[PDB]
Structure 1
Amino acid sequence: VPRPNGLEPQLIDDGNVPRDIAGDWVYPSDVLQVSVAVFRDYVWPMVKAGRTRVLVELGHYVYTLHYYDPQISLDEAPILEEWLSKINPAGIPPVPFCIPIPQVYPCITARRVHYAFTSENNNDSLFSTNAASIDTAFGENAAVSP
């Protein structure tokens, strides 16, 4: 619900009592499907500003990875904004998570801005972090689990 003369647009909370976007929200996935058009226009501009951590609560999703290079700078916002623009009241695209490619040496890294990160430990197929490398240095070493 929008508010007059410069007042925050209240986001109708669960109990059915419009609350304000600058806070911590829990988005029952289904909701996020018949609502993105809104999400992206009021809560999204908010999350980027770094003032409204939101938990999209979806049971078990498919998950696309995207390894970028920690050397160079990157801002994970568009590989997310796009994912949002592909959510119909019908179906959502496999949640995409950006992940730095694990380096061998101790490289200087560019401050990247990330947003998507799962709560449950869904890193169960990593297998190995730097097969050939004599030792991973910046990436997350993941010695072949015995």
Structure 2
Amino acid sequence: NLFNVARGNLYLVQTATNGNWSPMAPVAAPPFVRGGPNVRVVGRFGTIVPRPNGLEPQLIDDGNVPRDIAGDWVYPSDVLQVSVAVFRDYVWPMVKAGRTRVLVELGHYVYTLHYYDPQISLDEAPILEEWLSKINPAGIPPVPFCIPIPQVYPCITARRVHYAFTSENNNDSLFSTNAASIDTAFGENAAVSP
């Protein structure tokens, strides 16, 4: 992470936080892992069959069975480079609705941090939807995370909606968080590690 390459795989669940949101270092357990309970994997094509007369479009899973969208999904990255037009239309509104959670799993990747002021409201959809727009069959743009600037004073943060957080501790390269302050109040108080 000192070379701007984060290990582990990335998630896309809708987390409508209001306190501290540290994407690179998840303080919780990862929500689900591959092969868990009711955690299906997308197929080689990522093909979505649409169902008529008002049923849900089902998405063809790993074993070539049309499972439904809402729930959990392990979406391998090579499937994402060939079917991002089926992602952004069907399976991605069921992320923002808060009814499906995708583990877009790519083993290693370059990342990007967009810091922001947690006083002001911000939705992480167009920062993430711009990331889904530059995915070709060739490559992928680096994974964009949004981390709040750690505030010195106990602030009244807005309720924010973030989507991307990684599975493992990719916060190796975080030297300190408020090196000219008496104490960090709101944000991630990571002191200078001895």
| Category of TM-score, reference length = shorter chain | over 0.9
What is the TM-score of this pair, normalised by structure 1? 0.99
What is the deviation of 1:121? 0.5
Deviations 1:52-109, CA, capped at 9 Å, x for gaps: 0100010100000000111010001100001000000111000000000000011000
State the alpha-carbon separation in 1 of the partners of residues 99 and 67 from structure 2.
14
State the alpha-carbon separation in 2 of the partners of residues 53 and 101 from structure 1.
26
Query: Counting strand residues as a fraction of each chain, which structure ranks higher?
Result: 2
Deviations 1:15-50, CA, capped at 9 Å, x for gaps: 100101101000011001100000000010110000
Q: Aligned residue pairs: how many?
A: 146
State the alpha-carbon separation in 2 of the partners of residues 41 and 121 from structure 1.
31
What is the TM-score of this pair, normalised by structure 2? 0.75
State the alpha-carbon separation in 1 of the partners of residues 140 and 148 from structure 2.
24
What is the deviation of 1:127? 0.6
SS at match of 2:147: strand
Counterpart residue number, 2:96: 48
Identity across aligned pairs (percent)?
Answer: 100
* Over 4 Å off, 4+ runs: none
State the alpha-carbon separation in 2 of the partners of residues 82 and 129 from structure 1.
28
Give unpaired runs (5+ residues) of structure 1.
none
State the alpha-carbon separation in 2 of the partners of residues 50 and 81 from structure 1.
16
Give unpaired runs (5+ residues) of structure 2.
1-48
SS at match of 1:31: helix
Counterpart residue number, 1:91: 139
Query: Which of these residues, 99, 121, 127, is aligned with residue 73 of structure 1?
Result: 121
Higher RCO (CA-CA < 8 Å; seq separation 6+)? 2
SS at match of 1:132: coil
State the alpha-carbon separation in 2 of the partners of residues 112 and 17 from structure 1.
36
State the alpha-carbon separation in 2 of the partners of residues 66 and 134 from structure 1.
25
State the alpha-carbon separation in 1 of the partners of residues 181 and 127 from structure 2.
29
Query: Counting helix residues as a fraction of each chain, which structure ranks higher?
Result: 1
What is the deviation of 1:119? 0.4
Counterpart residue number, 1:114: 162
What is the deviation of 1:145? 0.2
SS at match of 1:84: coil
